[PDB]
Amino acid sequence: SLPLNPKPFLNGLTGKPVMVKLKWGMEYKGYLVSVDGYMNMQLANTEEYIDGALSGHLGEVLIRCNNVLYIRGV
Template sequence: MSIDPKNPLKVLHNAVNSTILIRLKDGIEYLGRLKICDNYLNMIIENAKEMMDGSVTAKFGEIFIRGNNILFIKPQAD
């Protein structure tokens, strides 16, 4: 079995203009379109939905998320 290692930054840079799910360390999740991401995982998300326990609690046009607050990032199938 061969495992193809992936660079997380490369995966994120390839996910620009795609939908992603981000969970922060405090448990809040954001679902939206990745506009830009830097090498520190700071990112701008467009059409973001804030979710708690799977339900939408707020909607934002554009948000900035600081990389050191991120627990995980999951690219979504569009």
């Protein structure tokens, strides 16, 4: 109902389990540790998923704004 921008959705989604998918077809699912202003983010306890199937958990991972395509709640 209320107007939720992308910066407020990224600030409210920090600390919770979400999934950030990139343009290359892969995605990182995990807890959002911190976010940046240039679309960059750092997650803790993240796992990689390619084609809807999990491959392995890497822990903390940093995704840039150019490589990250979208981010949703999980």
